Amino acid sequence: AFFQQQQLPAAMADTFLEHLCLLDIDSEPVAARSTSIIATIGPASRSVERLKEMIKAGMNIARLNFSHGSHEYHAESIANVREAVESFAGSPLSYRPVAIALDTKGPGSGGLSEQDVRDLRFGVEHGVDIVFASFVRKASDVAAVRAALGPEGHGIKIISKIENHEGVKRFDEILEVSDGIMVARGDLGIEIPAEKVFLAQKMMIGRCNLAGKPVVCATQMLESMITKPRPTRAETSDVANAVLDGADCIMLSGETAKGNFPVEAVKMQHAIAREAEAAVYHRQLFEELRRAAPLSRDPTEVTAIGAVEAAFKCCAAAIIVLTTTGRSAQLLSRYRPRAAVIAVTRSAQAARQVHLCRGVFPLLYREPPEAIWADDVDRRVQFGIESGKLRGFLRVGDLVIVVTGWRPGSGYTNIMRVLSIS
Template sequence: MRVPVSLFSDRPLSKCATVFQPWTAKSSFNILKVSRYSRDPLFSIKRIKKAKKWSERALPVWNLLRFWPKQQLDASMADTFLEHLCLLDIDQEPITARNTSIICTIGPASRSIPKLQEMVKAGMNIARLNFSHGSHEYHGETIKNIREAVETITTDPLYYRPVAIALDTKGPEIRTGLVRGTAEQEVELERGASVRVVTGEGDRDSTDGNVIWVDYPSLPQVLEKGGRIYIDDGLIGLKVLETDWVEALVESGGVLGGRKGVNLPGCDLVDMPAVSERDEGDLRFGVAQGVDMVFASFIRCGQDVREVRRALGPFGKDIKVVSKVESRQGVHNFLEILAESDGVMVARGDLGIEIPAEKVFIAQKMMIGRCNSAGKPVICATQMLESMVAHPRPTRAEGSDVANAVLDGADCVMLSGETAKGLFPVESVTMMHSICREAEAAIFQQQLFEELRRLTPLSNDPTEVTAIGAVESSFKCCAGAVIVLTTTGRSAQLLSRYRPRCPIVAVTRSPQVARQAQLLRGVFPVLFHPLPAPVWADDVDNRVYFGMNIGKARGFFKTGDMVIVVTGWIPGSGHTNIMRAVHVP
């Protein structure tokens, strides 16, 4: 039972600065509880206990009333990690606005316009197109459907979001051929059976229960006796018996379909190009279609990222390159990959085959941590809600997996087969949305912000300094949102780097910047269409008020709440240096 608060002020709620003696009980427990709702990272419990009179324990009244029963605020501002865990409460409400972006793979189950509309309303931020499958005509039609689906809800401020389109390259991967020459055929490989693995062009359509064709001519040269070949994300495992003609024993059997991925753990595939001829054609197609980002598969070093940028050419220079790390070599070269990339995807499917499964979580945490430290977006992907391909609810372990990716610091979480071919694509997005909201409320916010600030090198960049101050101020005044005006998206990315608890409403005139901002944790891009006002100060006010109206419509804050506004002092990009704390009119 909550103790009622006594207010000793006749001023309007939004104007009232403090609340005096909140209750007559003077137990240290009550004092400790009320201190949590200050949301002040520097507000120590020890300082509260040392206060000699109630006026020194004054707290913003609107903060107390607004956040008292919900959003795990007492836990998020704990003094220690153990105390943070002890204060988590299953009966508190989740965070108001989901900050983690959801990436959905679009396939046969989800490419229709009505289904895409449902997925956008359910929370899809980025649509991923897997170019390992499908023709350019197929993907061109899918892109058209995505844009039509988004356009139909443009006027609805509650559901509209500028959905980004990501092209996922085939990359330097190895795949099997079609079973008996057709995409619909499958074959059962029984445990203990012997099979031949062939690479000749004449055997391309010969895959059956005795022969498996793969598209890697150098296969006999890189294999060793006793080595392993894994097919279809490791569902089928072969042990190499002979390398001259590649005979193998089926150690773990299963159903083999066409065009399945092949992994050769421990093999050095130095002759495989970073960008294949097919990839170059796909990237040119993506540039022509105006995709917003590329998920570059099987990136092994920094040079591979540079090759992808070269293939994009001058017309694709503004496309974001997100490197998929899915091999041991990529993990070892992670820092140079990160330096060359706009973001990173922790692609756990192939990574879990290339390295021992029990070490995948170590690689995941390391990569997410280094991306957070560098201020670059990171995606956690593969088998997050895998059981929802066939079932309407995930397993408990899958729910915990998504939540832990959010707690680790992922900017985005990704759905693959769940939305591409599953029976419940919309339900999968809805479930992931709900899990992310609950997980974000349970983040140890005080520790996170302090560590991010401490690890950041000293900077004389006005934009970064302003971003740090804005995020800290958002904690101190319990802001409903940070509203930032951005031309290139850099200011929004710097704010996202320091992980404010409230949403970041990024107002921009650039459609591409708005879509690409979906990669960033906590950023809600808003597209401002009107032409600039003749007086620049008026134009700033117009954009700020537009962001406020959108924030109120989406329920981020209401009239009278405090928001932080971040702007520049002159027109153009690179001049962000003003932070204001204002009440929403």
């Protein structure tokens, strides 16, 4: 029964043609949904009661669109998101962190606009986790956003939105200085011919996957759901194909900000993403990602490939990783393991930000400390196991890969262990 579920016959295929021929509508997904959902906050999704239903439906990142709305309005949206998120903190083994992303208005007819400088300052003061920087055309645009975040915003992730021809042509220099990319198809589809957007999307997703940096697919994914309870056949296909392309995150704009079915739109993206993730051809994908990732003498990089290889060898249910900044979890995610990457961290911000990386499931550690560092490490790993069991990630008899480091502090991951559950 195990080998019939999660498209495993299609996963074991010798060719991509045979992989397609073996896809089965009766093969049910088993793994947890790995592609994060970004939902735009607006009149349809601002109330605390509404935000609780959206978190339960699968929202991982709340996007604030600063093109419209005053600072007072956005501060109230942030407070409502935080109230809804913290209403589930009473059960630490099931608590789900939710990131807050600030999407800038943009340069308009201008580099960095004066309104963007003020909005980025607001973002730092209100503790936002991510910035979706609008209309990024070159590396100096990213440097300007970084400077506007100041010394207190050094930890905020900058996701550059590629929205025009120049952004596509200067993609490599933009990606190099950004934490990730958003394929902002709305403006891109007006700036370049509509029939070419899929080429830009597939190229940018491919280059982000090669670089091991998060990539978001955005705009009109389930557009008809703004007024209708069910999406079109093209919309479900678009969501599935964005996941198959390699997108780390998928996004909802008007569907959740102003539409009549915000919760249903989140549920639909969750249902499609789970089905599409099981349909990924891991046999060729892992081989290509492994071959393309450069040779490295960084122990975190070396441990990550060894751990993902070990996970595939034993059909591991999960890779449990201890991380301070999220980096060790991101390096595991870049190889696209089928095994869930359960990231145990004490940092509330890193727990929110790792939603940008496909297949990273953040767990915020709030248990009492242990006097012996090795005992504290073991307890965090056992916490990952208990949370995994409660959430359905793990069962007794499963094998897990555990990734830790040799000393406290970030940057010292160098150990991979094979553990039997219970």
